[PDB]
Amino acid sequence: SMLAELITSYRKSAAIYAFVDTGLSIHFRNGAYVDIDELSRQCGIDYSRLDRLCDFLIEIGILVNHGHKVTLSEECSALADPESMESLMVKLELSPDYWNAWSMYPRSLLENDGKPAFEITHGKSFFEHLASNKLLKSNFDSLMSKVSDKIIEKLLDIYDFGQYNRILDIGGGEGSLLVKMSEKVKGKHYAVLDRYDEIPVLENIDFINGDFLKVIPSGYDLYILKDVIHDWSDNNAILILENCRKAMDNGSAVLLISMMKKPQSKMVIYFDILMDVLFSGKERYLTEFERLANQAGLVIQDVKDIDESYSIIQLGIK
Template identity: 40%
Template sequence: MSLEIVTAYRKSNALFAFVDSKAPLYLSTQDLSTQDGKTVEQLSQLCRVYQDRFHRLLDYMQTLNVLTKKDDKFYLTEQWASLSDPNSFETLYIRFELDPAFWNAWSQYSASLSKRNKKSAFELTHHEPFFDYLNHENNKTIKAIFDNLLAKMTDEMNKHIIEHIPLNGISSFIDIGGGVGSFSKNIKIHYPHIQCHVMDQYDFTRQESEEITFINGNFFSAIPSGYDAYSIKNVLDDWPDNQAIDILKNCHKAMREDSVLYVIDMIKEPNDPASFDLYMDTLLLGRKRYQSEFEFMAKQAGLSITNIYNLNFSTENGSYYIIEMKK
């Protein structure tokens, strides 16, 4: 029996507590520091926490190589320097995935596997689906973290998408579930002639910003029609097969005969890490899919896959592709 697996949660919880205390915002690296390090007394006062207990957390962060210490002063290590930025990908990722709202959902994962149950572990915990929870007024902070995290991920992917997505001859484009519009803004930079729209659930009906039109909508109800190109990025893996097919069916209804749909997502490979699938199942009943499963869903929606473009972009969860679909 490997106790490291059993106790691994301690590292995650301690890291979240460290970030949540805002201590990293007062720290820099020792080598590139433009300011002095901070003692435990200084950090405790800045973060308004109990000094003796916080000292234990800082010592553990040193053990994990998050912090280094010299002359009683703590510094971030080079590896974790990004934690000093509240909007870095790493900070946002920690604040989102390890937030108690999502962490607590794992306690219901075992119950969610029951054949009598058709709800995700998250829904069993919070009594409503993930996206409904995010859209509550009192959950705006975590919703903002989620949107900013997705935008950061899009920023990383953008140059790879732009290099491979065929947009020549395209005059109008809509990104379904496009959040804050990072992808469309990037398209506008490289293809300024393309009219770019973004559809997602907003607290307004329609709004213009940076030459992008944002439209409030729900892809389970209806998708705006008449565009040359549609994209749906990192969305289908959020949903079980029946609902993912419903989204594709609504895309089909909105598309003209000569329109194209670009599904930008991971395609599962036999040796891919399995933990991400469990994570998606816990939050959403979602999942990664093999190419054959995308082909099946496309067929059920009246679409066919006409091309697949490798983005040459991978994360620890898998490799991304553009899956081109047409009527």
């Protein structure tokens, strides 16, 4: 039935995580035909249990049966590529620390404490936990870097970054966006503000240890907020934008690089629930960004689409 298939959906995601996390996926590179017997011996997995997992992966369309051999479906080739967006998503969002948060989503909904499912599960915030977990931070950084790679060319095409001399990436993390921007836009002062244990050093990028909820440094022409605002409640988002305005002088701009909810959104609605589970965050309509900005003596000057999900929103002082 439709309902039965929806209820048991999670088993498909868990099986794909096992396929990658156990190292099975490595053996399926370049459309290779794989003997399950030899695969069991290579990976140190019980033959019968591996054969049953392969039968499940065949049923859901990940693998294709070829008698005594199996192959990765050409539609799913990305699972054999560790640097593919899909492989990076599997290694991050299906990891135990993420997975286990979802079973506390109902409790979080009834609590009305503001505490997200992830915090109920782990007893600390997502970024507090990420700072304490080397492997999760590595998987997170790898995905962030891949997203930077995916959008950078379209971003440089639709927005003139050349007009700004001093650019601060607010919550820029490992700074992959400005790294890829500095490859094509030259002779600029690039800075990244985030929370660092050890301040990363990188030629052409100044890294600043700070807190954007308290203060943002003045003297920058462009302030960038990529995938930051959607982590926060309305009041905390307004606080960040108020702190941007306080840092800004006449002529300066804020550029939000954000998913945007739209009437015809499907992927964004799907992603919005993950933001609730991890952050008590949310994806916002343009009209919601309008109000947030207004409250911070800022105003939307322009909006452009990168793709189906991501838009850029230029703010100026109100």
